[PDB]
Coordinates of C-alpha atoms and ligand atoms in Angstrom, one line a residue:
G1 CA 83.1 43.5 -7.1
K2 CA 84.6 46.9 -7.3
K3 CA 82.8 48.0 -4.1
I4 CA 84.0 44.8 -2.3
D5 CA 87.6 45.4 -3.5
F6 CA 87.5 49.0 -2.3
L7 CA 86.1 48.1 1.1
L8 CA 88.7 45.3 1.5
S9 CA 91.5 47.6 0.6
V10 CA 90.4 50.1 3.2
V11 CA 90.0 47.6 6.0
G12 CA 93.3 45.9 5.2
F13 CA 95.0 49.3 5.3
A14 CA 93.3 50.0 8.6
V15 CA 94.2 46.8 10.5
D16 CA 97.8 46.0 11.5
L17 CA 99.8 43.6 13.6
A18 CA 100.2 46.4 16.1
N19 CA 96.4 46.7 16.8
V20 CA 96.3 42.9 17.6
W21 CA 99.6 42.3 19.4
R22 CA 100.8 45.6 21.0
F23 CA 97.6 47.3 22.0
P24 CA 96.4 44.4 24.3
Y25 CA 99.4 44.6 26.6
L26 CA 99.7 48.4 26.6
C27 CA 96.0 48.7 27.5
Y28 CA 96.4 46.0 30.2
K29 CA 99.5 47.7 31.6
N30 CA 97.7 51.1 31.7
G31 CA 94.5 49.9 33.5
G32 CA 91.7 49.6 31.0
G33 CA 89.8 52.8 30.0
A34 CA 92.2 55.2 31.5
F35 CA 94.3 54.2 28.4
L36 CA 91.3 54.6 26.0
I37 CA 90.5 58.2 27.0
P38 CA 94.0 59.6 26.2
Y39 CA 94.3 57.0 23.3
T40 CA 91.2 58.4 21.6
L41 CA 92.1 62.0 22.4
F42 CA 95.6 61.6 20.8
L43 CA 94.1 59.5 18.0
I44 CA 92.0 62.4 16.8
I45 CA 94.2 65.3 17.6
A46 CA 97.6 64.0 16.4
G47 CA 97.0 60.8 14.5
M48 CA 94.3 61.9 12.1
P49 CA 96.0 65.1 10.9
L50 CA 99.4 63.5 10.8
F51 CA 98.1 60.4 8.9
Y52 CA 96.4 62.8 6.4
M53 CA 99.5 64.9 6.0
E54 CA 101.8 62.0 5.4
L55 CA 99.4 60.5 2.8
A56 CA 99.1 63.9 1.1
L57 CA 102.9 64.4 1.1
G58 CA 103.5 61.0 -0.4
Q59 CA 100.8 61.4 -3.0
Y60 CA 101.7 64.9 -4.2
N61 CA 105.5 64.6 -4.2
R62 CA 105.6 61.1 -5.6
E63 CA 108.7 60.3 -3.4
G64 CA 109.6 58.1 -0.5
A65 CA 110.4 59.0 3.1
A66 CA 113.8 60.4 2.4
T67 CA 113.5 62.1 -1.0
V68 CA 110.1 63.7 -0.3
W69 CA 112.0 66.5 1.5
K70 CA 113.0 68.3 -1.7
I71 CA 110.3 70.8 -0.6
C72 CA 112.4 71.6 2.5
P73 CA 115.9 70.3 2.1
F74 CA 116.9 70.5 5.8
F75 CA 114.6 67.6 6.9
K76 CA 116.2 64.8 4.9
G77 CA 117.5 64.1 8.3
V78 CA 114.0 63.5 9.5
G79 CA 113.5 61.2 6.5
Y80 CA 116.6 59.2 7.4
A81 CA 115.5 59.1 11.1
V82 CA 112.2 57.6 10.2
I83 CA 113.9 55.1 7.9
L84 CA 116.2 53.9 10.8
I85 CA 113.2 53.6 13.1
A86 CA 111.5 51.5 10.5
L87 CA 114.6 49.3 10.3
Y88 CA 114.6 48.6 14.0
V89 CA 110.9 48.0 14.2
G90 CA 111.4 45.5 11.3
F91 CA 114.0 43.6 13.3
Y92 CA 111.7 43.0 16.2
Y93 CA 108.5 42.6 14.1
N94 CA 110.2 39.8 12.2
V95 CA 111.1 38.2 15.6
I96 CA 107.4 38.4 16.6
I97 CA 106.3 36.8 13.3
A98 CA 108.8 34.0 14.0
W99 CA 107.0 33.5 17.3
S100 CA 103.7 33.4 15.5
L101 CA 104.9 30.8 13.0
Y102 CA 106.3 28.6 15.7
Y103 CA 102.9 28.7 17.5
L104 CA 101.1 27.9 14.3
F105 CA 103.3 24.9 13.7
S106 CA 102.9 23.7 17.3
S107 CA 99.1 24.1 17.0
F108 CA 98.7 21.4 14.3
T109 CA 97.7 18.7 16.8
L110 CA 94.7 17.4 18.8
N111 CA 96.2 18.0 22.2
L112 CA 97.4 21.6 22.3
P113 CA 100.6 22.0 24.2
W114 CA 99.3 25.1 26.2
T115 CA 96.5 23.2 28.0
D116 CA 98.2 21.3 30.8
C117 CA 101.6 20.6 32.4
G118 CA 103.6 17.4 32.2
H119 CA 105.7 18.1 29.1
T120 CA 109.5 18.3 28.8
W121 CA 109.5 22.1 29.1
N122 CA 107.3 22.1 32.3
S123 CA 109.0 23.1 35.6
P124 CA 108.1 21.2 38.8
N125 CA 106.3 24.3 39.9
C126 CA 103.7 24.1 37.0
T127 CA 100.2 24.3 38.4
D128 CA 97.2 23.0 36.5
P129 CA 93.7 24.3 37.3
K130 CA 92.2 20.9 36.2
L131 CA 94.8 18.5 37.7
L132 CA 94.7 20.2 41.1
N133 CA 92.4 22.2 43.3
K134 CA 101.6 33.1 40.3
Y135 CA 101.3 33.8 36.6
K136 CA 104.6 32.3 35.5
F137 CA 103.5 28.8 36.5
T138 CA 100.3 28.5 34.5
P139 CA 100.3 26.0 31.6
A140 CA 100.1 28.7 28.9
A141 CA 102.6 31.0 30.5
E142 CA 104.9 28.0 31.1
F143 CA 104.6 27.0 27.5
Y144 CA 105.3 30.5 26.2
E145 CA 108.3 31.0 28.5
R146 CA 109.9 27.6 28.2
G147 CA 108.8 25.6 25.2
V148 CA 109.1 28.6 22.8
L149 CA 111.5 31.2 24.1
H150 CA 113.4 28.9 26.5
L151 CA 113.8 31.9 28.7
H152 CA 114.6 29.7 31.7
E153 CA 118.2 29.5 30.4
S154 CA 119.2 33.2 30.7
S155 CA 119.9 35.2 33.8
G156 CA 119.2 38.5 32.0
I157 CA 120.2 40.7 29.1
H158 CA 123.9 40.0 30.1
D159 CA 123.6 36.3 29.5
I160 CA 121.3 36.1 26.4
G161 CA 123.1 32.9 25.3
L162 CA 122.9 31.2 21.9
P163 CA 120.1 31.5 19.3
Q164 CA 117.3 28.9 19.6
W165 CA 117.4 26.7 16.5
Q166 CA 113.6 26.2 16.3
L167 CA 113.0 29.9 16.3
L168 CA 116.0 30.3 14.0
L169 CA 114.4 28.0 11.4
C170 CA 111.0 29.8 11.8
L171 CA 112.7 33.2 11.3
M172 CA 114.6 31.8 8.3
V173 CA 111.3 30.7 6.7
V174 CA 109.6 34.1 7.5
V175 CA 112.6 36.0 6.0
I176 CA 112.6 33.9 2.9
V177 CA 108.9 34.5 2.4
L178 CA 109.4 38.3 2.9
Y179 CA 112.3 38.4 0.4
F180 CA 110.4 36.5 -2.3
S181 CA 107.4 38.7 -1.7
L182 CA 109.5 41.9 -1.9
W183 CA 112.0 41.2 -4.7
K184 CA 109.8 42.1 -7.7
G185 CA 108.0 45.4 -6.8
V186 CA 105.1 46.9 -5.1
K187 CA 102.6 45.1 -7.4
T188 CA 103.0 41.9 -5.4
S189 CA 101.8 43.5 -2.2
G190 CA 98.4 44.5 -3.6
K191 CA 97.0 41.0 -3.8
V192 CA 97.4 40.0 -0.2
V193 CA 94.6 42.2 1.1
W194 CA 91.9 39.5 1.0
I195 CA 93.4 37.3 3.7
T196 CA 94.1 40.2 6.1
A197 CA 90.9 42.1 5.3
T198 CA 88.5 39.4 6.5
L199 CA 90.3 37.0 8.9
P200 CA 91.2 39.5 11.7
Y201 CA 87.6 40.8 11.9
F202 CA 86.1 37.3 11.9
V203 CA 88.5 36.1 14.6
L204 CA 87.9 39.2 16.7
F205 CA 84.1 38.8 16.4
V206 CA 84.3 35.1 17.4
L207 CA 86.6 35.9 20.3
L208 CA 84.3 38.7 21.6
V209 CA 81.1 36.6 21.3
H210 CA 82.7 33.7 23.1
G211 CA 84.4 35.7 25.8
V212 CA 81.3 37.6 26.8
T213 CA 79.7 34.3 27.7
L214 CA 82.4 33.1 30.2
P215 CA 82.3 32.5 33.9
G216 CA 84.7 35.4 34.8
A217 CA 84.1 37.9 32.0
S218 CA 81.8 40.1 34.0
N219 CA 84.4 41.4 36.5
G220 CA 87.0 41.7 33.7
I221 CA 84.6 43.9 31.7
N222 CA 83.8 45.9 34.9
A223 CA 87.5 46.5 35.4
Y224 CA 87.8 47.5 31.7
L225 CA 85.0 50.0 32.0
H226 CA 86.4 51.5 35.3
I227 CA 88.5 54.6 34.8
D228 CA 91.3 55.6 37.3
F229 CA 92.2 59.2 37.0
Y230 CA 95.2 58.9 39.4
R231 CA 96.6 56.9 36.5
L232 CA 95.7 59.7 34.1
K233 CA 97.8 62.1 36.2
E234 CA 101.1 60.3 35.6
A235 CA 101.9 60.9 31.9
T236 CA 103.0 57.3 31.4
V237 CA 99.6 56.5 30.0
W238 CA 99.9 59.5 27.7
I239 CA 103.3 58.6 26.4
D240 CA 102.2 55.0 25.8
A241 CA 99.0 56.2 24.1
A242 CA 100.9 58.5 21.7
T243 CA 103.4 55.9 20.8
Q244 CA 100.8 53.2 20.2
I245 CA 98.8 55.6 18.1
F246 CA 101.8 56.4 15.9
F247 CA 102.4 52.6 15.7
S248 CA 98.9 51.5 14.8
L249 CA 98.3 54.3 12.2
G250 CA 101.7 53.6 10.7
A251 CA 102.6 57.3 10.8
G252 CA 106.2 58.3 11.5
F253 CA 107.8 55.1 9.9
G254 CA 108.0 56.3 6.3
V255 CA 105.5 53.6 5.4
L256 CA 102.6 56.0 4.6
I257 CA 104.7 58.3 2.4
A258 CA 106.3 55.4 0.4
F259 CA 102.9 53.7 -0.1
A260 CA 101.2 57.0 -1.1
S261 CA 103.9 57.8 -3.6
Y262 CA 102.4 55.0 -5.8
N263 CA 98.8 56.2 -5.4
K264 CA 96.9 57.9 -8.2
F265 CA 97.2 61.7 -8.4
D266 CA 93.4 62.0 -7.7
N267 CA 93.0 59.6 -4.8
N268 CA 91.1 60.9 -1.8
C269 CA 93.5 61.1 1.2
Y270 CA 90.9 62.8 3.4
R271 CA 88.4 59.9 3.2
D272 CA 91.2 57.4 3.6
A273 CA 92.4 59.1 6.8
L274 CA 88.9 59.3 8.1
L275 CA 88.0 55.7 7.5
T276 CA 91.4 54.4 8.7
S277 CA 91.1 56.4 11.9
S278 CA 87.5 55.3 12.6
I279 CA 88.2 51.6 12.0
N280 CA 91.4 51.9 14.1
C281 CA 89.4 53.4 17.0
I282 CA 86.6 50.8 16.8
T283 CA 89.1 47.9 16.4
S284 CA 91.1 49.1 19.4
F285 CA 88.1 49.4 21.6
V286 CA 86.9 45.9 20.6
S287 CA 90.3 44.4 21.1
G288 CA 90.5 45.9 24.6
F289 CA 87.0 44.6 25.4
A290 CA 87.9 41.0 24.3
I291 CA 91.3 41.1 26.0
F292 CA 89.8 42.2 29.3
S293 CA 87.0 39.6 29.0
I294 CA 89.6 36.8 28.5
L295 CA 91.8 37.9 31.4
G296 CA 88.8 38.3 33.7
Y297 CA 87.9 34.7 32.8
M298 CA 91.5 33.8 33.7
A299 CA 91.3 35.7 37.0
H300 CA 88.2 33.6 37.8
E301 CA 89.9 30.4 36.8
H302 CA 93.4 30.7 38.3
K303 CA 91.8 32.3 41.5
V304 CA 94.1 35.4 41.3
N305 CA 93.3 39.1 41.1
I306 CA 92.8 40.7 37.7
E307 CA 96.0 42.7 38.1
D308 CA 98.3 39.6 38.3
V309 CA 96.8 37.1 35.8
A310 CA 99.1 37.8 32.9
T311 CA 102.4 39.4 32.0
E312 CA 102.3 43.2 31.2
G313 CA 105.1 42.9 28.6
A314 CA 105.2 41.5 25.1
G315 CA 103.7 38.1 24.7
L316 CA 100.4 38.9 26.5
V317 CA 98.5 37.8 23.3
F318 CA 100.5 34.6 23.1
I319 CA 99.7 33.8 26.7
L320 CA 96.1 34.9 26.5
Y321 CA 94.5 34.1 23.1
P322 CA 95.6 30.5 23.3
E323 CA 94.0 30.3 26.8
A324 CA 90.7 31.6 25.3
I325 CA 91.0 29.2 22.3
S326 CA 91.4 26.2 24.6
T327 CA 87.9 26.8 25.9
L328 CA 86.3 26.7 22.4
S329 CA 84.8 23.6 20.8
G330 CA 87.0 22.0 18.3
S331 CA 89.8 24.2 19.6
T332 CA 92.3 22.9 17.1
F333 CA 90.6 24.5 14.2
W334 CA 90.2 27.8 15.9
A335 CA 93.8 27.8 17.0
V336 CA 94.9 27.1 13.4
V337 CA 92.6 29.9 12.1
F338 CA 93.8 32.4 14.7
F339 CA 97.5 31.8 14.2
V340 CA 97.1 31.9 10.4
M341 CA 95.4 35.3 10.9
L342 CA 98.4 36.4 13.0
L343 CA 100.9 35.2 10.4
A344 CA 99.1 37.1 7.6
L345 CA 98.9 40.3 9.6
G346 CA 102.5 40.1 10.6
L347 CA 103.7 39.4 7.1
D348 CA 101.7 42.3 5.7
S349 CA 103.1 44.7 8.3
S350 CA 106.6 43.5 7.7
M351 CA 106.2 43.9 3.9
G352 CA 104.9 47.4 4.5
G353 CA 107.8 48.4 6.6
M354 CA 110.4 46.8 4.3
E355 CA 108.8 48.5 1.3
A356 CA 109.1 51.8 3.2
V357 CA 112.8 51.3 3.8
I358 CA 113.5 50.0 0.3
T359 CA 111.6 52.8 -1.5
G360 CA 113.1 55.5 0.8
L361 CA 116.6 54.4 0.2
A362 CA 116.1 53.7 -3.5
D363 CA 114.5 57.0 -4.5
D364 CA 117.5 58.7 -3.1
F365 CA 120.1 56.6 -4.9
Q366 CA 119.4 55.6 -8.5
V367 CA 122.0 52.9 -8.6
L368 CA 120.1 51.2 -5.7
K369 CA 116.8 51.5 -7.5
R370 CA 118.4 49.9 -10.6
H371 CA 119.2 46.7 -8.6
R372 CA 116.1 46.1 -6.6
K373 CA 116.8 42.4 -6.2
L374 CA 120.3 42.8 -4.7
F375 CA 119.2 45.8 -2.5
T376 CA 116.2 43.8 -1.2
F377 CA 118.5 40.9 -0.4
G378 CA 120.9 43.1 1.4
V379 CA 118.3 44.8 3.6
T380 CA 116.6 41.4 4.3
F381 CA 119.9 39.8 5.2
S382 CA 120.8 42.6 7.6
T383 CA 117.3 42.4 9.2
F384 CA 117.7 38.6 9.5
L385 CA 121.0 39.0 11.3
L386 CA 119.8 41.7 13.7
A387 CA 116.7 39.6 14.4
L388 CA 118.8 36.6 15.1
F389 CA 120.4 38.8 17.7
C390 CA 116.9 38.8 19.4
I391 CA 116.4 35.0 19.1
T392 CA 118.9 34.1 21.8
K393 CA 117.7 32.5 25.0
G394 CA 117.4 35.9 26.6
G395 CA 115.8 37.3 23.4
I396 CA 112.7 38.7 25.2
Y397 CA 114.9 41.2 27.0
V398 CA 116.5 42.5 23.8
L399 CA 113.0 42.6 22.2
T400 CA 111.7 44.6 25.1
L401 CA 114.6 47.0 24.9
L402 CA 114.1 47.5 21.2
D403 CA 110.3 47.9 21.5
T404 CA 110.8 50.5 24.2
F405 CA 113.6 52.6 22.7
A406 CA 113.8 52.2 18.9
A407 CA 110.5 53.9 18.6
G408 CA 108.7 56.0 21.2
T409 CA 110.6 59.2 22.0
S410 CA 112.5 58.8 18.7
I411 CA 109.3 58.4 16.6
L412 CA 107.5 61.2 18.5
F413 CA 110.4 63.5 17.8
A414 CA 110.5 62.5 14.1
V415 CA 106.8 63.1 13.7
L416 CA 107.1 66.4 15.5
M417 CA 109.9 67.5 13.2
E418 CA 107.9 66.4 10.2
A419 CA 104.9 68.5 11.2
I420 CA 107.0 71.5 12.2
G421 CA 109.0 71.4 9.0
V422 CA 106.0 70.9 6.6
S423 CA 103.6 73.4 8.2
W424 CA 105.8 76.2 9.4
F425 CA 108.5 76.2 6.7
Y426 CA 106.8 74.9 3.6
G427 CA 103.6 76.9 4.2
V428 CA 100.4 75.4 5.6
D429 CA 98.7 77.5 2.9
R430 CA 101.0 76.1 0.3
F431 CA 100.2 72.6 1.5
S432 CA 96.5 73.3 1.4
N433 CA 96.8 74.6 -2.1
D434 CA 98.6 71.4 -3.1
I435 CA 95.8 69.4 -1.6
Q436 CA 93.3 71.5 -3.5
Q437 CA 95.2 70.9 -6.8
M438 CA 95.5 67.2 -6.1
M439 CA 92.0 66.1 -4.8
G440 CA 90.0 69.2 -5.6
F441 CA 89.0 70.8 -2.3
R442 CA 91.0 72.8 0.3
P443 CA 91.2 71.2 3.8
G444 CA 89.0 72.8 6.4
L445 CA 90.2 75.2 9.0
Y446 CA 90.4 72.4 11.6
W447 CA 92.9 70.5 9.5
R448 CA 95.1 73.5 9.0
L449 CA 95.0 74.4 12.7
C450 CA 95.8 70.8 13.7
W451 CA 98.7 70.7 11.3
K452 CA 100.2 74.0 12.3
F453 CA 99.6 74.6 16.1
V454 CA 97.7 71.9 17.9
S455 CA 99.5 68.7 16.8
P456 CA 103.1 70.2 17.1
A457 CA 102.2 71.5 20.6
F458 CA 100.9 68.2 22.0
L459 CA 103.8 66.3 20.2
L460 CA 106.3 68.6 21.9
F461 CA 104.6 68.2 25.2
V462 CA 104.8 64.4 25.0
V463 CA 108.4 64.5 23.7
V464 CA 109.5 66.6 26.6
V465 CA 107.6 64.6 29.2
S466 CA 108.9 61.2 27.9
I467 CA 112.4 62.6 28.6
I468 CA 112.0 64.2 32.0
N469 CA 109.6 61.6 33.3
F470 CA 111.4 58.4 32.2
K471 CA 111.3 55.3 34.3
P472 CA 114.0 52.6 34.3
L473 CA 113.3 49.7 31.9
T474 CA 112.0 46.5 33.4
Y475 CA 110.4 43.2 32.2
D476 CA 107.9 41.8 34.7
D477 CA 110.1 41.2 37.8
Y478 CA 113.4 41.7 36.1
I479 CA 115.1 45.1 36.4
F480 CA 117.5 45.9 33.6
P481 CA 121.0 47.0 34.5
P482 CA 121.8 50.7 34.0
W483 CA 123.9 50.1 30.9
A484 CA 120.9 48.6 29.3
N485 CA 119.1 51.9 29.7
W486 CA 122.1 53.7 28.4
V487 CA 122.2 51.5 25.3
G488 CA 118.5 52.0 24.8
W489 CA 118.9 55.8 24.9
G490 CA 121.8 55.5 22.5
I491 CA 119.5 53.6 20.2
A492 CA 116.9 56.3 20.4
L493 CA 119.5 59.1 19.9
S494 CA 120.9 57.2 16.9
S495 CA 117.8 58.2 14.9
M496 CA 116.9 61.4 16.8
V497 CA 120.3 63.1 16.1
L498 CA 120.2 62.7 12.3
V499 CA 118.2 65.9 12.0
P500 CA 120.7 68.4 13.4
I501 CA 123.6 66.5 11.8
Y502 CA 122.0 66.8 8.3
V503 CA 121.1 70.5 9.1
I504 CA 124.6 71.4 9.8
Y505 CA 125.9 69.3 6.9
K506 CA 123.6 71.1 4.5
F507 CA 124.5 74.5 6.0
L508 CA 128.3 73.9 5.5
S509 CA 127.8 72.3 2.1
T510 CA 126.0 75.2 0.4
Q511 CA 127.9 78.3 -0.8
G512 CA 127.1 81.9 -0.1
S513 CA 126.4 84.2 2.8
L514 CA 124.6 83.1 6.0
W515 CA 121.3 84.6 4.9
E516 CA 121.8 83.2 1.4
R517 CA 122.7 79.7 2.9
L518 CA 119.5 79.8 5.0
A519 CA 117.4 80.8 2.1
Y520 CA 118.8 78.1 -0.1
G521 CA 118.3 75.5 2.6
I522 CA 114.7 76.6 3.2
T523 CA 113.5 77.2 -0.4
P524 CA 112.2 74.2 -2.3
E525 CA 114.8 72.7 -4.6
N526 CA 112.8 73.7 -7.8
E527 CA 112.6 77.4 -6.8
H528 CA 116.3 78.0 -6.0
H529 CA 116.4 80.8 -8.7
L530 CA 114.3 83.0 -6.5
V531 CA 117.1 83.2 -3.9
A532 CA 119.2 85.4 -6.2
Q533 CA 116.2 87.7 -6.5
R534 CA 115.9 88.2 -2.7
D535 CA 112.3 87.0 -2.8
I536 CA 111.8 84.7 0.1
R537 CA 108.4 84.2 1.7
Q538 CA 109.9 82.9 4.9
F539 CA 111.6 86.3 5.5
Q540 CA 108.3 88.0 5.8
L541 CA 105.9 88.1 8.8
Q542 CA 102.9 87.5 6.6
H543 CA 104.0 83.9 5.9
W544 CA 104.5 83.1 9.6
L545 CA 101.2 84.8 10.6
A546 CA 99.2 82.8 8.1
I547 CA 96.5 80.4 9.2
Ligands
LNR601 N1 99.3 47.7 35.7 C1 97.8 47.8 35.8 C2 97.2 46.5 36.1 O1 97.5 45.6 35.0 C3 95.7 46.6 36.2 C4 94.8 46.0 35.4 C5 93.4 46.1 35.6 C6 93.0 46.9 36.6 O2 91.6 47.1 36.8 C7 93.9 47.6 37.5 O3 93.4 48.4 38.5 C8 95.2 47.4 37.3
LNR602 N1 103.1 49.5 12.7 C1 104.2 48.7 12.1 C2 104.9 49.6 11.1 O1 104.1 49.8 10.0 C3 106.3 49.0 10.7 C4 107.4 49.7 10.5 C5 108.6 49.2 10.1 C6 108.7 47.8 10.0 O2 109.9 47.2 9.7 C7 107.6 47.0 10.3 O3 107.8 45.6 10.1 C8 106.4 47.6 10.6

């Protein structure tokens, strides 16, 4: 029983809504394997050391995202930045979960709505492969676009319109469930592992086994296994891979630190990082394989090329997985099972993010930690309103803008600042000593080098490239107006600029000389007495030249 519980905990921690929903369309947009090569490279190099470092920080300091920076006061801005990023991602994650709940509700029938045209939401251009000899006019795409989003009533992000009442009700139910699953404490989140630790793997295995034996899966798999290096020479794939890695692993959102703050003081963070990274890699590879099998089948069915079967934006899963399910026997049961799995995964991810935000903002303010119910209600209500903002007719455009800009460059910068702060200022040797005291063994030279030099270097490279090489935002065949890009960059800067603001605020809040102010702002808060003794390690070349 204990072994099963441990295994289930590990797998549930490893899987996420990101791996199931976001990775499909990012891999499809970026070719196939051409995305897996850089994805795996970044996974190892940045994700594994950063995941390990975040878990270790949370476990050792016993604090959330914001308050953990008592070791280096100047990076409370980084903490607040990750909290804001988590808030935005929570908005649009809750919107996605509302989509999933609507699909589950509509799946409770014998004639699935995404099988043929002829409904009230079907345009006259709907084409049915079975009722007759582009991608927008397929029955599943038609359903997703019209009978769920009702996107056919908005001309763009400038005419989003009014919230859809069906999606409004689904979002209300999702938010009520989240609030009642978050209002008591962390303990309630530890008993939901069983549903999310088995269903995703069972569904993925069934989908893989079925898709392999499909008329058009061969060419889809061939395209998946074909690598285009001219795509590897564009840096869009690299930016997407880095962002998706930091999404799937959960690093950079404050979730890992907050969750680890509640761990035992002797837990093995190294093994946790290893297992989570390995399972993430394998799950991502399998998800890509199944996704490309399904869309190769679709390319063979709709008689179109593999590059134009499905939309490259969000909703690829909601257009694809129903299509695969429609070909199974007793498709109603499989649809119910798959959408229940999606609901469970989304609820778990949203609970994790909301817990991150709540713990981070509650450890900083004691009055907020003393009223967990009211604080949870306030955060949940704000998230509900800002997600309602994305339920309008043109809600997919706002969702795309948020998904592109809230995270991405902002999360890369936040993680880069976390790594630079911790390693360079707090001492990689000091961090390794803390690890040794906590778990019992010093990390190997590879971990220290990755924390200090390799990971910050690649993170800086990607952060710069994502800024110089930035393409205007678009959704399929819709080109966003320039002010949309300006608003997106403002959203990213809203969390990127919290670091210098807090740095200058702390500098002008402390009293003393410039050198004294810097020493106070660099020293851990529990060693401030050493400042008066003129004993600062950061003022010696030995500390900076330490591997
Ligand atoms: N944007 C890339 C496009 O979706 C695509 C998918 C599969 C491919 O084999 C390909 O060459 C391009
Ligand atoms: N990968 C998703 C990530 O764990 C996350 C961060 C913040 C959130 O509000 C959320 O729902 C999920």
